[PDB]
Symmetry: D2
Subunit: 233 residues, 4 copies
């Protein structure tokens, strides 16, 4: 065991790494993207946030991988006469990792061919002809903005979504679920991912989000609480 666990019911920037537009509000909410002052989601916003202590996801000397689980509550709000864009994602990234492309890339990817050593679970609110399925989806991305697998997600605007993602070392099973307590709806997706193959032994852990790059496609991307836990060996 080489355990870690934390749980923030209110955020503070002192134990967080914030990149670009990410910020913690006076009410302790992690706000991944900008407001344009009219209280409106800024266009072309990109923000990432990670927990400040690196986590060891696997060990090359023992050949072991960690199991983990995380849960968070997010709220995405689209202003009137506008559409959702571009999405939000929880990600496991390399330690000094810097932001990538805006919009459809969720700040996590490039469309170039660099190995990003990134794994993420996205909550995609906008269709990208080139790789996205037709409907808003939850998706497991492994080194590409082209989800290795997905599930239809019925985006409800302004309602709090409760996510629960888990990875089991033995079965290599990654499983993401989401539920709208207000609507009583729920969605789940699961596929096997081999963390050792794509991820470095140590990674920073957190969120990434972007708003559409064109006028009428913007949404707020806020996380209200988060809890992570990882057990290695």
């Amino acid at each position: 065991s080489n355990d870690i666990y934390f749980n923030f019911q209110r955020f503070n920037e002192t134990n967080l790494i914030l990149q670009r537009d990410a910020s913690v509000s006076s009410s302790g909410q992690l706000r991944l993207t900008n407001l344009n002052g009219n209280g409106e989601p800024r266009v072309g916003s990109l923000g990432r946030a990670f927990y400040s202590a690196p986590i060891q996801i696997w060990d090359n000397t023992t050949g072991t991988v960690a199991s983990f689980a995380t849960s968070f509550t997010f709220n995405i709000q689209v202003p009137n006469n506008a559409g959702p864009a571009d999405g939000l994602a929880f990600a496991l990234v390399p330690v000094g990792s810097q932001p990538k492309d805006k919009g459809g890339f969720l700040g996590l990817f490039d469309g170039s061919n660099s190995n990003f050593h990134t794994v993420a679970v996205e909550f995609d609110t906008l269709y990208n002809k080139d790789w996205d399925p037709t409907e808003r989806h939850i998706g497991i991305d492994v080194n590409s903005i082209r989800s290795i697998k997905t599930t239809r997600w019925d985006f409800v605007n302004g309602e709090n979504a409760e996510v629960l993602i888990t990875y089991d070392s033995s079965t290599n099973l990654l499983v993401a679920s989401l539920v709208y307590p207000s609507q009583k709806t729920s969605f789940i997706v699961s596929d096997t991912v081999d963390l050792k193959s794509v991820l470095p032994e140590w990674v920073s852990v957190g969120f990434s989000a972007t708003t559409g790059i064109n006028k009428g496609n913007v949404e707020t991307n806020d996380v209200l609480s988060w809890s992570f836990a990882s057990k290695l060996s």
Copy 2:
């Protein structure tokens, strides 16, 4: 806080209440229903953890949040069909078994308030109340699930269940996944535990096999873990 938590990676009958055909194998598997190596017909078995759990408090008016997880394995013999199902249930303390088959051992079809809440894994259609397909369903005092979801039963594969109840939102959420098939199903609805359940309940499983020859399955739990936090 008035917490409880346990986790059995292997069962033993000393801290379990077994009813009817329930039993723990030499390998530590909770086997809810009977068998010469073939699932017995008309089998009924229930098993609960021996210490009652306080689900809610009338004096403080509070309800507990909880979560449980278990791995079960249902196996249908060749040239036979699945029947009747398996359910995780919260039941009154001295609760005794009810009807066989389609009632999963939990209900009657009479009008007694059973003060029972359960999440069923139904493997057989019962014209009178079941949906057409095999489903995961949330039952609140009735074998007629208050809500359900299509479940693609895979025979002999281990299913990993995760049920959770959140006191604040009253949200009950059941999910299942076949690590082998990489499939997953989820259901969620609001249940008010205070309304139907007594403050203290025994916690566990119930299962039955079909009452007619060709409808039988084994109903085995391989591991279980429960957790409840009151106040």
Copy 3:
């Protein structure tokens, strides 16, 4: 892992096994011993255990569980009276029934039956025959004659905070007590081999007695308890 954990910040009799005078008050306090007019009854004996048996060790795997528990008790002696006889946390055989009163804390006999009992006592009365001269915290293994002890400065009516822990690897049993009000603290530690004395499964809880003679009585109350055991 074959874990268990619980934590009662207020007792209720539904998940407890009460023996003799043990009882839970309307305020949810486990009261191990009686009253007669609101004064600790003489010759009282009360035991209380958590209702689900705990597996302390496994003969097939040869493993032993590590555990920890913590509770807050309060012993109060009435005016012009002396403390007696004591309170103890014990690991006992599953259907175990009470033993002798007074100095035996309800856990022992003075006969030579193997009681398969292990307990940590909080002794408030000197028993010439086996007790040390001063009030002590003691580790008892199958005998009311503690295998080891430490001076305990009993403060009357103040809440004591106990913390007992057993580590499988080192076989180290360690008991400590602190009076948050007085800022005092006491600790004892010795190695005990649970496999040698205890059965694989045991009931877990408390036992307490009041002196058998008029002016030796105290109340024996537990206010909160928390147990945790991890096997393998």
Copy 4:
């Protein structure tokens, strides 16, 4: 709740802040002080902290966190040499840099700056000016002059198992230590008001030093550590 918990059964420098001679060995042991031969270097000073700041209290809600930590350390003195200077677990301000060597354990100055530091020391050397006569475990609050202490029978080369806990309600700080090999144990407890001395956020870890004179040196190694804090 704004919880945190971690547990390292083997150290790696990637989630640690190391200062001066602190280093993680190939075997994953946090070695707070240097060597040379393989002898403890004289005048060594090393500090190590967990990389994410912990919030110890909140000015807006006025709440303080309860916490607990446990670690196993091993201090070894070379033949024909004496222990010096000590080891300490400390809660320090976030960017905090090292202080004086030897007797100051790297945590203090002897000047009159508020160090906003709270530490539990395992002092192996008497310092006429402020130390008690015997080797002690002590609670330091802003000064190398422990606010309270307890005799500690240092056993050379044996693994010591420490357990420190802080309870927000009672403000009680309680440190204990046991040598599973010797079966000895020691405990100290006093009330400390974290809000009064500590900033809301602090880095958490260890500090240690070796004697500044030839014959006074020891190794200062931590073999495992686990911290836990619950705020509100």
